[PDB]
RNA sequence: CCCAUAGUAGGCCUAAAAGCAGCCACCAAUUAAGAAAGCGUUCAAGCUCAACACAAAAAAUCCCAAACAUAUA
RNA sequence: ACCUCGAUGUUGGAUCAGGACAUCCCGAUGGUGCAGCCGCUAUUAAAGGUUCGUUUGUUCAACGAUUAAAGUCCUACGUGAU
C-alpha cells in the first residue's frame, strides 16, 4: 500500500474500490499496484 | 488551538470573514433605494 | 455495424525548419547597468499582447500572473521537445526572454543600503496571455496530455486551450453577462459609485469589472 | 507449440539463429537438420524457404516446406542482388507485368493462399505493392532496350552507396 | 555464412527468362508468355500510389477500407501519447 | 526465477559531510560572542566487510547510500558523523572497477573501504584567532564518494556440469542435490562439494563463468546419434577459449538411459574409450552413488593444489 | 501589503459584500428539459457501405437459389478457414452479413419467415448447386456446429429438410 | 417476475424458469408527457428517504436497488433514490429486505443504535477529535447533498451539516 | 468465453445442446453454444465433446451437462439468459470437481 | 463486452534485431485487421488494443458554546 | 523594534519533569529487486522505555564498552524566591 492524493491504475488488472471512507487500487496480478486514497 | 497569528482583523494572516445570508439582502435593499434616485435625478 | 465518419488530413500542413523551441538564456546580451523600481501593476489585469493564435492551433493559456524565470522555461522547453514528434509538431515561444532584472540583497540585510545587486532576470506575464504555442499535424487531444503537465508546473494557473475551445470559452463568458438573473453586476455598482462603494475600490476596478484580485484571475465571475 | 522461420534452403546449421530456438523446445536440432537438408534437396540451395515447425508433446516434430518468399522471386526476375535503401526517392529494379504473373502462379500454390481459395487477380494485386517496397518499379510493357539503361545507372547508383558506406566506417574507425 | 543465391545479370536473359520461378535444379528457366496470352485484368492494375480517398465511389468495399484504415491511424496516435 | 548469485553490479554512494554554520554568538554582557558555527559532521563509510556465515551473495542491494553527516550547528555543536555502512559478501570475493583488479578479500573480518564518506565542513569558529577576530568563512561539506562497483563472487563450483542443452544438466542437479544454477553434494565425514551448471556455440559468456570451477563434468545423452562427435565439440569450443581447461579432469557421462535404453549407443562410447566414463539416468536417479563417490576423491587431490595454492580450499 | 501579492490576499469586508451580492445566477427554466418529451432526433443519412451491403445481399437471394443459415460459432481461425477451403473445393461460399442490415431485407421480401433464423453470430452457407450432400458430411466432422436451416428453391427447409434433401 | 428454481432428484440437477405474476403500473398517470416513472406522477423534489412506499418499488427483495435501465429512471432521480434507499435500510425503516444469511450463520448482538438521515456508512466513519476554530469547524454531514433542492415549505433551507 | 476458460472442463464428460432456431426463446441459448464451442474452452478439455443436435419439432431448448462423476446438470434456455446459464453451469464445475479430489 | 488466421522475419542497416535497436516506404489476401499504439524477448515466441460480429494532511497544559436537515420572512 | 531600562545576566549540568508524533525500541499490518534470517519502505500505535564513561565550561561531537533502543522537538532555547 502506497498513498497517493491521486490514484491511477497501474495496469489492465488493477480495479478501483470505495473501501472504509476512502477509495482503494487492487491489484491482485501485481501486489505493488495496491494504492490508499491520502 | 486555532490561533490567529498577531491581531485578528489585520496583518497579512487575518481571520477569515464571511457574508452571512442577511448581510447580503441588507446590500441589496440599499442598492435598490439608490437605484431608485438615480430614476429621480434624470428627469 | 459501427459509425464510421471522415477524418481530418493534416497533408498540406507545413512544418518548420526548427520545430523543436529555441534554448533561452539567463539573462539578456546587454545588461542593465541602472536597477528599475518593482512596478508589480506588469502582472495586474488582463493581458492586451499575444492574446491570439499566430502560427499554431494549440496554445497554454495563461490564466493568471506570474513571473517566469530561467528555471521555469527549462522545464517547458525540455519537457515539450521530448514529448512532441518533429515531424509533424512544432513549437514557438510567445513570451520574451527574461529582461526586468530581479535584485536581490545578500543575507543578513537589514533595512535601508538602498537597491540590492541585480540577482536575476524574470518575463512578467498577465492573464490571458498565451505563454507557448503548438500547431502542425496532430490534433487537440494528442498535444493536450503533455500541455497540461507542463501547464501545471507554471508559476500560475495554467491550461492548454485550442482555437476552437477557446473561442467557445470566450463565448460562454459572453452568454453569461448576458443571461444572468441577477440586477446587480460589478461593472453598475462600481461605475456609478453605488453605496460609496467606490471608497474601498480601485481605480483599476473600474476598467477590471470585478474579474481580476491582484494576480489572480476569476472565469465565473460576470 | 507452432513456431514459424525462414529458413535458407538446404543451409540449415545447427547453430544459431534457429538452433537456441530449438534447444528450448527440446526438438533434436540434428534430427530436423537432416530432414530438412534430405527433403529441400530438389530446390537450389540458399534459396530462403519459410519454415513451419510443428511440435509434439512428446518433443516430435514434422517440419513443413511452403513458397519461397516474393522477395527472392522479384529481385531475381530483375536481377537485383539487394534491395534499395530507400523507397520512392530511387528505383531499385525493373520488372514487368509478365513476370509478377509467372511468379504468382507458383507463389499462389502455397498452403496460405490454397486454404482461402482466392483468385490470381488478387494474388497478382498483392505482389505489386511488394515490389513497391523492394524499389522495384512495375511497368505494363518493357524491353531490353530500356532495362539495359537503367541496369547500367542503378550500378552507378549503387558505386555511390558503396562510397558513402566506406566513408562511414572510416569516419567509424577515426572514433 | 549463409547468403542468398547468386543472380545472374545479364538484361538479356533476365527479359526473356524469370529467374526467380524455376527453383528446381533440374528443372529449366520459364520463358515469358507474349503480351496476348496473359489475361485482360493483368494490365489494368494500379501500378502507381494508391488511389485517396476522394477518388473512391462510395459505394465499393475499398472506399471503405481506406476510411476503417485512417482511423486505426486516428486511434493509434492518440493512444500514444496516453 | 531462482538463481544462483554471480557478478553482480552494485552501485555505492558514500555519505556527504556536513557544510558549517558560519553564525556569530550574542549574549547579554559581552554581545559580542565572536564566530560559534560547529563544524559539518563526516560522511559515511562504505565498507565491505567478509562474512563466514552467508556462504552466497545474496544480499545483492540495487544501490547502497552512506549517511550523509549532519551540518554543523550554533553554539560551536559538530554535526554527527554518518552512519558506516557494512555489506555482507561471501570469502574470497573478487571486487573491480571493470578495468582493473582492485582488491581481493583473504578470509572472514576483512574489511575494505568502497566508498570514502565525505568530508565534514569547518565552521566559521575553526577560523577564529587572535589576527582573525571575526571570521565569516565557512567551508562546504565535500561530497562523499560514489562510484560503480562489478562485485564478482568466485562461484562455489568444486564440479562444473558442462554439454549442450536437453542433454539433462539441471535434471541431474536436482536429483543429486535432493543463468547458472548450483547445487551442493553431501557426503559421508561431512563433507561437502558443490556442483554448477548453465542451463539456457555455447558462448564465450559461458565458458568464462564456467571456467571458475574445479572439476568439469561432461554429459552427453544416449539418444544422441553421434556422442562422440558431441563430445569433441564441447572440447574444442572450450579449448578454443582455452587449452589449460581440458588439462584438468574430466568424466564423460551419459543421460537418458532408463527410457530409450539405447545399448547400442552405449558400447560406442565403450569402444572408444578414451576415458573411464559413468552411465547414469538422472530421472531414475541410477548409479548417482558411483560417480559421486569417484567425485568427491577428485576432489580430494584439488585439495592438495589448494595446499600449493594457498588459498583456503573452500570450507573443505 | 502591496497591491498585488502570491497569496490570496484578503478582500475588504464591503468589497467582499459586493462580490457574494453580484454573483453569476445562471437562468433556471420552469420545467426541466429532460422531464419535457425531447424533440424527435434529426433524420440520419444512411451510410454507404450499408446501402452497398443490401445490393450485395439482394444478389445472394437472386443469384444463387441454395441459401444454408447457420450458426457462425467461436471455432478457431485455422479450423473456421480449413472448413471454408473444404466448401470452397465443393463450390460453397460462406457469406456473413450483420443482422442489423440482414433482417430490415427480409422484413418485406419473399424471405420473411428467415426472420426469427438470424438472431446471434450467423453465416450463410450458398452454392448456385445445391450440393446439400457434400455439405452435410462437411459439418459432421463438427458434432457442436449447429444447422438452423435454410430456402432451396424459394422454398424454406428445416435441416431435416436438408437431410432428406440429401439422400 | 421471473423465479429460478433448483430440483435435483436422482442425482439429477434440473434448472427451469418459472414465470409469475407481474405487477402493473397503476393506470392514468398524472403527467403522461414524463420522461421517467418520478415526473409522471409529479414526484420530483416531492419525496424523502421516509417514503418507504415509494423506495420498496425499486428494490430488490434482498434490499438491493434496482438498475436504472429496467425501472426506467432518469439519471438524476435514480441517484436521488439510491442514496434514498441507503437511508432507509440505516434508519431501521425496511425490516423486510434484510440481506440474505447463508445457513448455519447466526448473527452477533450487537448495539442497537438507532439512526437517521445517515449519509455514510457507520462502519467507515471516525470520530471528529478536534473540532477546529470557528472559522474553520468540521461540521457533520446530516442527510444527503443529492436532496437539496427539496421542495422546503420553510423558509431556512435544509442544514445538510451539523 | 474468458470467464469460463480460466475455470476449465476438467471434470466435464460431455455437453448437449439441443434447441429450435425457428422458434423466439432460444437466443441465450445459441449464444451459450457460441461460448462454449470456444476455442479456448475446449482446447482446456479435449476429452470433453460438444453435442448441438438441430431439431424441428416445435419443443423448448435445454442444455444437458454430462460429467465423470455421472451427475447431470440441466439447464432449460426458453426462460434462462445466457450469463445465467454461464454462471449457474460454472458454479458445478467448481462443486464437481472439489468432490472428485 | 467479444475477437484476431493471413502477401511476410516489407526491405535497408545490423552477430541476428522480425510490427515493436534504428531507419525508407506505409501498399495488401480475406466478411474484417496498424508494413503496429503499448508492454515481453540477445533476437524470435508470447501477448493487449485498433477490425468484422454482438479531488490530502500533522506540534507541543485540555476538543471546545450547547445543539438542531421539514409549520409558510 | 511591538512589549520589559523604578532589581530575571546568560550558557551548561543536577533535580523533577508535563506535552507533541513528523516513531529510535517494544505491538499490529501492506509492498519488496520479501526463500529463511537479516533488511528496505508504507499505514497504524505515544500505554512503556530510551545507558555508563575519557578529554573538553560544555550543548554538540569524537571513540570506549553496551543495550530491544540509546528518537526528533517544544515547554520564559521547561525548571536558578530548588
Ligand atoms: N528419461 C530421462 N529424461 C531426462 C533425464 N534427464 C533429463 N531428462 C529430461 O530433460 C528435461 C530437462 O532438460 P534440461 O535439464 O533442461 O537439459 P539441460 O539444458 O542440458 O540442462 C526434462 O523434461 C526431462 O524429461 C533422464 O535421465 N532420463
Ligand atoms: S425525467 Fe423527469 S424526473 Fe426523471
Ligand atoms: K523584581
Ligand atoms: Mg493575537
Ligand atoms: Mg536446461
Ligand atoms: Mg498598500
Ligand atoms: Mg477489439
Ligand atoms: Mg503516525
Ligand atoms: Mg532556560
Ligand atoms: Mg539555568
Ligand atoms: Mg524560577
Ligand atoms: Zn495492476
Redesign the pocket.
Known amino acids: 500500500?502506497?498513498?497517493k492524493?491521486?490514484?491511477?491504475k497501474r495496469?489492465?488488472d488493477c480495479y478501483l474500490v470505495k473501501r472504509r471512507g476512502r477509495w482503494y487500487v487492487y491489484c491482485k496480478t501485481?501486489?505493488?499496484?495496491?494504492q490508499?486514497?491520502? | 488551538?486555532?490561533?490567529i497569528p498577531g491581531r485578528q482583523w489585520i496583518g497579512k494572516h487575518r481571520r477569515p470573514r464571511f457574508v452571512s445570508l442577511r448581510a447580503k439582502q441588507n446590500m441589496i435593499r440599499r442598492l435598490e433605494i439608490e437605484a431608485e434616485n438615480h430614476y429621480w435625478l434624470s428627469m | 455495424?459501427?459509425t464510421?465518419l471522415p477524418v481530418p488530413s493534416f497533408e498540406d500542413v507545413s512544418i518548420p525548419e526548427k520545430p523543436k523551441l529555441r534554448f533561452i538564456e539567463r539573462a539578456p546580451l546587454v545588461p542593465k547597468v541602472r536597477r528599475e523600481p518593482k512596478n508589480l501593476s506588469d502582472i495586474r489585469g488582463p493581458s492586451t499582447e499575444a492574446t491570439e493564435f499566430t502560427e499554431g492551433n494549440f496554445a497554454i493559456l495563461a490564466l493568471g500572473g506570474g513571473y517566469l524565470h530561467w528555471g521555469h522555461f527549462e522545464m517547458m522547453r525540455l519537457t515539450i521537445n521530448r514529448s512532441m514528434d518533429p515531424?509533424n509538431m512544432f513549437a514557438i515561444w510567445r513570451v520574451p526572454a527574461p529582461f526586468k532584472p530581479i535584485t536581490r540583497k545578500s543575507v543578513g540585510h537589514?533595512?535601508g543600503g538602498g537597491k540590492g545587486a541585480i540577482d536575476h532576470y524574470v518575463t512578467p506575464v498577465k492573464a490571458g496571455r498565451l505563454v507557448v504555442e503548438m500547431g502542425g499535424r496532430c490534433e487537440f487531444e494528442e498535444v493536450q496530455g503533455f500541455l497540461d503537465q507542463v501547464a501545471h508546473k507554471l508559476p500560475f494557473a495554467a491550461k492548454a486551450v485550442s482555437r476552437g475551445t477557446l473561442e467557445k470559452m470566450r463565448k460562454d463568458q459572453e452568454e453569461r453577462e448576458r443571461n444572468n438573473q441577477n440586477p446587480w453586476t460589478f461593472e453598475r455598482i462600481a461605475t456609478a459609485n453605488m453605496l460609496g462603494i467606490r471608497k474601498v475600490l480601485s481605480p483599476y476596478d473600474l476598467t477590471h469589472k470585478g474579474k481580476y484580485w491582484g494576480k489572480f484571475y476569476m472565469p465565473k465571475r460576470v | 507449440?507452432?513456431?514459424?522461420?525462414?529458413?535458407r534452403a538446404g543451409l540449415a546449421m545447427p547453430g544459431?539463429?534457429?538452433g537456441?530456438?530449438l534447444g528450448?523446445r527440446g526438438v533434436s536440432i540434428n534430427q530436423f537438420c537432416k530432414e530438412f537438408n534430405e527433403r529441400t534437396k530438389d530446390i537450389k540451395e540458399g534459396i530462403?524457404l519459410?519454415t513451419?515447425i510443428l511440435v509434439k508433446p512428446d518433443r516430435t516434430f514434422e517440419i513443413k516446406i511452403?513458397?519461397?518468399?516474393?522477395?527472392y522471386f522479384l529481385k531475381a526476375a530483375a536481377g537485383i542482388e539487394?534491395?534499395?535503401?530507400?523507397?520512392?526517392?530511387?528505383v531499385?529494379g525493373l520488372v514487368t507485368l509478365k513476370h509478377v504473373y509467372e511468379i504468382a502462379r507458383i507463389?499462389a500454390q502455397?498452403?496460405?493462399?490454397a486454404?482461402?481459395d482466392?483468385?490470381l487477380?488478387?494474388?497478382v494485386?498483392?505482389?505489386?505493392?511488394?515490389?513497391?517496397?523492394?524499389?522495384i518499379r512495375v511497368v505494363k510493357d518493357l524491353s531490353s532496350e530500356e532495362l539495359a539503361a537503367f541496369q547500367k545507372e542503378r550500378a552507378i547508383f549503387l558505386a555511390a552507396?558503396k562510397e558513402a558506406?566506406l566513408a562511414?566506417?572510416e569516419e567509424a574507425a577515426k572514433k | 555464412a549463409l547468403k542468398?543465391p547468386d543472380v545472374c545479370t545479364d538484361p538479356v536473359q533476365l527479359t526473356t527468362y524469370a529467374m526467380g520461378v524455376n527453383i528446381y535444379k533440374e528443372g529449366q528457366d520459364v520463358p515469358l508468355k507474349p503480351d496476348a496470352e496473359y489475361p485482360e485484368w493483368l494490365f489494368e492494375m494500379?501500378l502507381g500510389?494508391?488511389?485517396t480517398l476522394e477518388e473512391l465511389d462510395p459505394e465499393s468495399?475499398?472506399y471503405?477500407?481506406?476510411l476503417?484504415?485512417?482511423?486505426?491511424?486516428?486511434?493509434?496516435?492518440?493512444?500514444?501519447?496516453? | 526465477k531462482?538463481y544462483f548469485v554471480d557478478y553482480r553490479r552494485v552501485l555505492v554512494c558514500g555519505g556527504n559531510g556536513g557544510a558549517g554554520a558560519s553564525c556569530f554568538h550574542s549574549?547579554?554582557?559581552?554581545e559580542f560572542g565572536g564566530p560559534?558555527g560547529?563544524?559539518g559532521?563526516?560522511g559515511g563509510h562504505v565498507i565491505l566487510r567478509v562474512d563466514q556465515?552467508?556462504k552466497?551473495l545474496?544480499?545483492?542491494?540495487?544501490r547502497y547510500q552512506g549517511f550523509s553527516?549532519?551540518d554543523?550547528?550554533?553554539?560551536?555543536?559538530?554535526?554527527?558523523?554518518?552512519?558506516v555502512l557494512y555489506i555482507?559478501v561471501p570469502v574470497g570475493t573478487l571486487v573491480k572497477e571493470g578495468g582493473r583488479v582492485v582488491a581481493d578479500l583473504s578470509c572472514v573480518g576483512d574489511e575494505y573501504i568502497a566508498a570514502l564518506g565525505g568530508a565534514?565542513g569547518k565552521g566559521n569558529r575553526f577560523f577564529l584567532a587572535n589576527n582573525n577576530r571575526a571570521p565569516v568563512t565557512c567551508t562546504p561539506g565535500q561530497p562523499g564518494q560514489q562510484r560503480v562497483l562489478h562485485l564478482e563472487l568466485k562461484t562455489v563450483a568444486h564440479a562444473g556440469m558442462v554439454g549442450f542443452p536437453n542433454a539433462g544438466k539441471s535434471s541431474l542437479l536436482r536429483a543429486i542435490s535432493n543463468k547458472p544454477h548450483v547445487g551442493i553434494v553431501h557426503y559421508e565425514g561431512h563433507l561437502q562439494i558443490a556442483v554448477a551448471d548453465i542451463p539456457?556455440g555455447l558462448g564465450s559468456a559461458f565458458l568464462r563463468h564456467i571456467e571458475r570451477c574445479r572439476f568439469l563434468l561432461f554429459v552427453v545423452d544416449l539418444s544422441q546419434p553421434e556422442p562422440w562427435t558431441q563430445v569433441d565439440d564441447l572440447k574444442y569450443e572450450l579449448e578454443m577459449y582455452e587449452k589449460g581447461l581440458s588439462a584438468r579432469p574430466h568424466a564423460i557421462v551419459a543421460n537418458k538411459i532408463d527410457l530409450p535404453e539405447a545399448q547400442a549407443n552405449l558400447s560406442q562410447l565403450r569402444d572408444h574409450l578414451g576415458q573411464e566414463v559413468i552411465v547414469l539416468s538422472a530421472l531414475t536417479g541410477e548409479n548417482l552413488e558411483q560417480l559421486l563417490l569417484h567425485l568427491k576423491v577428485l576432489y580430494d587431490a584439488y585439495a592438495e593444489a589448494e595446499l600449493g595454492q594457498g588459498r583456503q580450499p573452500l570450507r573443505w | 501589503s502591496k497591491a498585488v501579492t502570491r497569496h490570496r490576499r484578503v478582500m475588504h469586508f464591503q468589497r467582499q459584500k459586493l462580490m457574494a451580492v453580484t454573483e453569476y445566477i445562471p437562468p433556471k427554466p420552469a420545467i426541466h428539459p429532460s422531464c419535457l418529451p425531447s424533440p424527435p432526433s434529426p433524420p440520419q443519412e444512411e451510410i454507404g457501405?450499408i446501402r452497398?451491403?443490401r445490393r450485395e445481399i439482394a444478389a445472394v437471394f437472386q443469384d444463387n437459389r441454395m441459401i444454408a443459415v447457420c450458426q457462425?460459432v467461436?471455432?478457431?481461425?485455422?479450423d473456421?478457414?480449413?472448413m471454408?477451403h473444404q466448401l470452397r473445393k465443393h463450390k460453397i461460399?460462406?457469406?456473413?452479413?450483420?443482422?442489423?442490415?440482414?433482417?430490415p431485407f427480409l422484413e418485406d421480401s419473399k424471405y420473411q419467415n428467415l426472420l426469427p433464423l438470424?438472431?446471434?453470430?450467423?453465416?450463410l452457407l450458398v452454392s448456385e448447386e445445391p450440393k446439400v450432400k457434400e455439405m452435410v458430411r462437411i459439418l459432421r466432422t463438427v458434432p457442436f456446429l449447429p444447422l438452423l436451416g435454410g430456402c432451396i428453391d424459394d422454398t424454406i427447409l428445416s435441416r431435416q429438410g436438408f437431410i432428406n434433401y440429401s439422400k | 417476475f421471473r423465479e429460478v428454481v433448483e430440483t435435483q432428484e436422482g442425482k439429477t440437477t434440473i434448472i427451469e424458469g418459472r414465470i409469475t405474476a407481474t405487477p402493473k403500473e397503476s393506470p392514468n398517470p398524472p403527467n403522461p408527457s414524463g420522461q421517467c416513472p418520478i415526473c409522471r406522477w409529479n414526484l420530483k423534489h416531492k419525496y424523502?428517504?421516509?417514503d418507504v412506499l415509494l423506495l420498496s418499488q425499486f428494490i430488490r427483495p434482498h434490499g438491493g436497488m434496482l438498475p436504472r435501465k429496467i425501472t426506467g429512471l432518469c439519471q438524476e432521480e435514480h441517484r436521488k433514490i439510491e442514496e434514498?434507499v441507503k437511508?432507509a435500510h440505516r434508519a431501521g425503516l425496511l425490516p423486510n429486505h434484510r440481506p440474505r444469511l447463508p445457513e448455519g450463520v447466526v448473527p452477533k448482538s450487537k448495539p442497537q443504535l438507532n439512526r437517521?438521515?445517515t449519509r455514510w456508512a457507520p462502519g467507515s466513519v471516525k470520530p471528529?477529535?478536534?473540532?477546529?476554530?470557528?472559522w474553520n469547524?468540521?461540521?457533520?454531514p446530516?442527510?444527503?447533498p443529492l436532496?437539496?433542492d427539496?421542495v422546503?415549505?420553510?423558509?431556512?433551507?435544509?442544514?445538510?451539516?451539523? | 468465453?474468458?470467464?469460463l476458460?480460466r475455470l476449465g472442463l476438467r471434470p466435464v464428460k460431455q455437453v448437449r445442446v439441443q434447441f429450435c432456431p425457428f422458434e423466439k426463446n432460444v437466443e441465450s441459448t445459441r449464444?451459450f453454444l457460441?461460448?462454449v464451442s470456444?476455442?479456448?474452452?475446449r482446447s482446456t478439455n479435449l476429452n470433453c465433446s460438444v453435442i448441438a443436435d438441430v431439431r424441428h419439432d416445435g419443443s423448448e431448448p435445454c442444455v444437458d451437462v454430462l460429467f465423470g462423476d455421472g451427475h447431470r446438470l440441466i439447464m432449460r434456455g426458453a426462460h434462462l439468459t445466457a450469463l445465467e446459464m454461464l454462471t449457474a453451469f460454472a458454479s458445478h464445475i467448481r462443486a464437481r470437481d472439489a468432490a472428485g479430489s
Not at chain 4, 125 to 135: D, K, P, Q, V, W
Not at chain 6, 58 to 62: C, G, H, K, M, Y
Not at chain 6, 72 to 83: E, L
Request: charge should be positive.
Open positions: 500500500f502506497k498513498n492524493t491521486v490514484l491511477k495496469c489492465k501485481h501486489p505493488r499496484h495496491k490508499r486514497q491520502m | 488551538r486555532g490561533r | 455495424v459501427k464510421l515531424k537589514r533595512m | 507449440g507452432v513456431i514459424r522461420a525462414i529458413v544459431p539463429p534457429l537456441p530456438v528450448q530462403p519459410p513451419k511452403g513458397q519461397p518468399t516474393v522477395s539487394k534491395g534499395a535503401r530507400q523507397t520512392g526517392k530511387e531499385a507463389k502455397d498452403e496460405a493462399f486454404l482461402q482466392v483468385p487477380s488478387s494474388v494485386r498483392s505482389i505489386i505493392g511488394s515490389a513497391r517496397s523492394l524499389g552507396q558506406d562511414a566506417q | 542468398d494500379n500510389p494508391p488511389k468495399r475499398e471503405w477500407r481506406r476503417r484504415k485512417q482511423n486505426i491511424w486516428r486511434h493509434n496516435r492518440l493512444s500514444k501519447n496516453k | 531462482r549574549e547579554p554582557r559581552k560559534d560547529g563544524d559532521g563526516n556465515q552467508v552466497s545474496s544480499s545483492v542491494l540495487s553527516g549532519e554543523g550547528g550554533s553554539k560551536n555543536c559538530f554535526g554527527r558523523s554518518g552512519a555482507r565534514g539456457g | 457501405l452497398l451491403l457462425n467461436a471455432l478457431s481461425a485455422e473456421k478457414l480449413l471454408r461460399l460462406m457469406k456473413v452479413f450483420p443482422n442489423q442490415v440482414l433482417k438470424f438472431v446471434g453470430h450467423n453465416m | 424523502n428517504y421516509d434514498c437511508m437517521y438521515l471528529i477529535y478536534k473540532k477546529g476554530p470557528r469547524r468540521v461540521r457533520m446530516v442527510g444527503s436532496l437539496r427539496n422546503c415549505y420553510s423558509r431556512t433551507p435544509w442544514k445538510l451539516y451539523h | 468465453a474468458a470467464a476458460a449464444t457460441q461460448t470456444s476455442e479456448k474452452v
